């Protein structure tokens, strides 16, 4: 479409603009997988900072695992891992005769970058182990859990399993810095199965999750005071129940019944869905104008499903005000700098066949203040910019964005215009005299039919 | 005075400016109940997720409680609520002799809208009770306290009474929706005592109180490690005293001394005051530029007064710091799903008859994101928008709006062109060619005299 | 330069522009301590709130404290404060034959301004003790440290001393004050040392250290029920381990290794770094947009350095979640309302004289709002102002401005132009019109050799 531009170009002119920095992040944010390989750029801020912009890209080949890569994650294995029984696998072999479900779920843990879960068959709510289990494993080790959410032991019936996503680099570089900021984070999974096996459905949604460290309040009655005489006058012991702050620890909001794929694709208008062959791609969009750096803080994680007690909301006696409503954090069993500010994500792939392979790749760009003897002092760059237009421009297109794509649409063709077009009526800007493009009403029906982009020109999808 | 811009539309033009719906968010925001009742609208951020927006209006016939109203809170009513005794309403009933003093105090709290206190007389500071209360009650039903804040048992000196204002539809509706908004609030009163009783003077301030999730030291000294051979040799106990934190709680700064009213109509230009006659009507304002989705969080609520011990300030031992300074968080007993960033109004009402009647209706607007399988899903709307000239316009006229209102004056004169009086030199639009009006200095005389409003016009105010 | 913007004041006009009282509140900021001494004015936001604005200029005489100057930290000062034993004191006499460190680190604390460290050589990193130490003294009064990071006793082998610098008064108006801001901060050091002994260097930076409110895990395995018969059955005791929140503490994030003066003068571009004799003259600046009111909140303050142990990061068993990364938090023994936002500074001078003399004086500017009663109330103003256009201004200069400054550096050229210069490509307005000046990269080599400003002319340095 370079004709449109070469002929529009002589009827209006450009005020103070996006400079070619703010664009380069732009372009490495909305679309991290993208073009925007060749080169990285960092958050157009001025920091006036040393920084180091490190860029990690990783593949997976999920697969239904073998027998020697499930572990059980009850009493039984919290000395060490346990290796799932034969007798147990069973079971869980039993899923191949039919198809499965899987579920990705990327919440903004640096480290840990997905959580990834496989159910004999979709799951009412995505629900969790109220005890912290043994050993949670990361790929391509798994660990398996009760029909319902319980850790299991050996000889029980499983429901699903489960296995993070662990990026070492990522923890080594973490452990040397002063500072950090998630700058921008993609992933994609492309679906592939025997073919003539290709039924399956995919749907894909993020949201802001956003958690914050807090405490749950726990009471154990534990003795206070007992006199003695050397065991002769023990008659007094004074044990009472106390209420107090368990550990801290980074609570994230996700509710449980909510994230079922029907849900997810009916509340949420950009929730990209469509068949599970297409694949699929997401691009994490921040939630907030700005993105401060963040000290190295590594704590436990943890969710919270709704409460169970009423408690104070009703008229209450004083000394179970304590206890009020009774709500509960599940852990998780790990520990993550976590970044907030940015969507969780979660992506279910429904009916797949059970033994599809699904290659999935990752690319997460971090940016660093390095600690001056480390690695990434060897690695730093000092030319900070400043354009607040760009960060304007992303607080703009945020919302009109759709939740994910295709895994083959990672070539765009509406970057370099779009902004200009919300540059028209960027109200910093009283009259822009931008003649981009006039805004379309996009409909981007991925499972089916003719699909149409912000300008309404037809994607040239075909094979 | 539809002649002046009948006249003058023809000397300027306008730019971009805002939309009829973040017009129609901006008139539910700064007047919740005026003319605006006709249809509600929802934050203009463009959140481009499935909302709906509830109103609710209550009323309620604030009076002198008959006995059967009241309830003690001491520990003799402890497993349940008890009726005030006959001899201790005596002393209650002796305040109907003379005048009598209304306190209203609303935090930002959804489910209790408003806190309801009765005083013999105007009291010196806003006190609360040491010991957590025992039921605290809600409208109609009251709870009593001693003369100073302490909780009443039957037979003890009555200082004052209090009762809350819960909404059970709020409640309903909030324990079903993923995240809430406050999209506006406001009290109104009309307060009406027999003719030729009319005495009394009414003054209403509200000031931002932005409290956090926060927990208060405790020190128990209880035993660690105690052994024994069969009651033979149990010499060493071992017990010590040990700082922890206490259940966490969202903690509201309100200083007591300073919620009297002299120190509110003197320190807050804007606290309005009048003759008690006249009523009062309070828009709560918002403090933020933004307003967030907040999850369903409910804890229990405290109050934050001045610290009692220096402790660290000055130097002290080692092993004395974990105390440091002593600072006591009161319990309201109630538990709420807060929300911040609004400002936590107060209106006091001193003189005011002994069987006077208080009309009092409230109105409160709020954005759920429901949750599929609610009632709230039924209701749903889906055409959000984005208007963030609107969001500055608001960000601009917080200072300059008078904290409260006549009860008769809930109709105005200048809201769609005081909008384009802050256009005018809004710095998002360099020249704005704004023709609307020239900002003057108002002058609210509301106690008596000649009243000035933005733009020197006088108001019909009469009977 | 007066001929210059008397010859371009001809050539273009101005649009909406700072106010007066906008350019005096920024000029206090940026320069707190140069001539905008003659009046003080608030922040500009229209707060429309009796506020009282209190500036404090404070003088201090750092010298090589005599021997009843130091007092022991450890076990043997825990009632009341100790003199340093002269056997002790030898040590550090020791200290006076080569030259020393002279480590200046000033926290957003409001009583304690900075806090003051000698060491007899520059230290690999700024340490601090586990154990909480006893009776922190305050200027003139020391307390000595052993040659690592912990508490002292009498006999010990000192490796440095340390002070805080206490101001009362704002200690006595922060007790009487519903809340407050910190306006500005400047601190100065005109370093001297007798004739012919000049050697040393100066490095001084400021950088967010974003503290909070948080706490600490504990464990203690306390006894929870024991039962008895009257000393017959006492065979369970029902001791366990149990992980809770320790008293809250704001923490502030520093990195030990990171505070050693190479790292921070080759991390940061605007660390300044000079020969001693220059002096230093460090303005602090805020880190944020806005600059909301705070209730003085008192709580002891603490300091995060690396954690130990991985914990939770790799696969743990359940019971051992609660530790997780054992991150130690360090007392500083000190309560203060801290007022984050503002910029952690840090100066160190090596290689000084021992019997060097520093006169040190510090500006700190503080809006109140009084509490009525209190002396506050009798200084109040009443013409609060908004102008937003210099806080944009504000927010664009804090990156381009350097940390530091040379002591006799206190008078400036290049205000009242370079804000005109922001205005120029401020995006607020299109095109401002602005003819002050084109900006200019700066070339600060305050060490020797030409320095080069904001605008290429050479500053009239000499002697």
Redesign the interface.
């Given at each position: 479409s370079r004709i449109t531009r070469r002929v529009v170009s002589n009827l209006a002119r450009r005020?103070?603009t996006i400079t070619t920095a703010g664009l380069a992040w732009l372009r490495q944010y909305l679309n991290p997988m993208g073009p925007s390989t060749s080169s990285v750029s960092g958050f157009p801020?001025?920091?006036?900072?040393?920084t180091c912009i490190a860029d990690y890209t990783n593949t997976f080949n999920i697969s239904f695992p073998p027998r020697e890569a499930i572990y059980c994650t009850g009493s039984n294995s919290?000395?060490k891992?346990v290796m799932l029984d034969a007798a147990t696998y069973a079971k869980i072999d039993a899923w191949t005769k039919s198809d499965i479900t899987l579920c990705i779920l990327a919440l903004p843990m640096l480290?840990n970058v997905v959580m990834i879960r496989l159910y004999a068959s979709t799951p009412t709510a995505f629900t969790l182990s109220e005890?912290?289990?043994?050993?949670?494993?990361?790929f391509p080790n798994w660990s398996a859990f009760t029909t319902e959410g319980k850790?299991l032991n050996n000889g029980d019936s499983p429901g699903y399993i489960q296995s993070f996503v662990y990026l070492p680099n990522v923890?080594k570089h973490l452990s040397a810095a002063?500072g950090f900021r998630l700058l921008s984070r993609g992933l994609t999974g492309i679906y592939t199965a025997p073919s003539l096996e290709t039924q399956g459905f995919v749907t894909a949604c993020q949201?802001?999750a956003?958690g914050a460290?807090?405490?749950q309040?726990?009471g154990?009655?534990?003795?206070?005071?007992?006199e003695?005489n050397?065991?002769?006058?023990?008659?007094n012991?004074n044990?009472k129940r106390?209420?107090?702050?368990?550990?801290?620890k980074f609570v994230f909001?996700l509710?449980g019944?909510?994230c079922a794929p029907?849900?997810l694709v009916?509340?949420?208008?950009?929730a990209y869905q469509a068949r599970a062959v297409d694949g699929f791609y997401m691009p994490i969009l921040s939630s907030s104008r700005d993105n401060?750096?963040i000290?190295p803080?590594?704590?436990?994680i943890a969710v919270?499903n709704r409460?169970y007690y009423r408690?104070?909301?009703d008229?209450?006696?004083?000394?179970k005000?304590?206890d009020?409503?009774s709500?509960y954090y599940y852990?998780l069993?790990?520990?993550?700098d976590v970044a907030p500010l940015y969507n969780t994500g979660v992506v279910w792939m429904e009916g797949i066949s059970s033994k599809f392979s699904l290659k999935l790749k990752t690319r997460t760009v971090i940016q660093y203040?390095?600690?001056?003897?480390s690695v990434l002092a060897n690695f730093t760059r000092?030319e900070?910019t400043?354009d607040?237009?760009a960060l304007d421009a992303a607080d703009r297109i945020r919302?009109?964005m759709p939740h994910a794509y295709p895994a083959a649409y990672n070539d765009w063709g509406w970057l370099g215009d779009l902004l200009d077009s919300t540059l028209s009526?960027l109200?910093?800007?009283?009259?822009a005299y931008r003649f981009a493009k006039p805004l379309i009403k996009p409909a981007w029906n991925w499972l089916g039919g003719k699909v149409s982009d912000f300008f309404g020109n037809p994607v040239s999808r075909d094979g």
């Open positions: 005020p103070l801020d001025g920091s006036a900072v040393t919290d000395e891992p480290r005890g912290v289990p043994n050993f949670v494993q990361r850790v923890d002063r949201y802001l956003e460290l807090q405490t309040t726990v154990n009655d534990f003795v206070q005071s007992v003695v050397a065991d002769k006058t023990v008659k012991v044990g106390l209420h107090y702050s368990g550990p801290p909001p509710e019944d909510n029907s849900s009916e509340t949420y208008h950009q401060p750096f000290s803080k590594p704590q436990p919270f409460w408690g104070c909301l008229p209450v006696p004083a000394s005000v304590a009020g409503p709500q852990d069993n790990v520990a993550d203040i390095p600690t001056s003897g000092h900070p400043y607040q237009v919302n009109m009526m109200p910093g800007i009283g009259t």
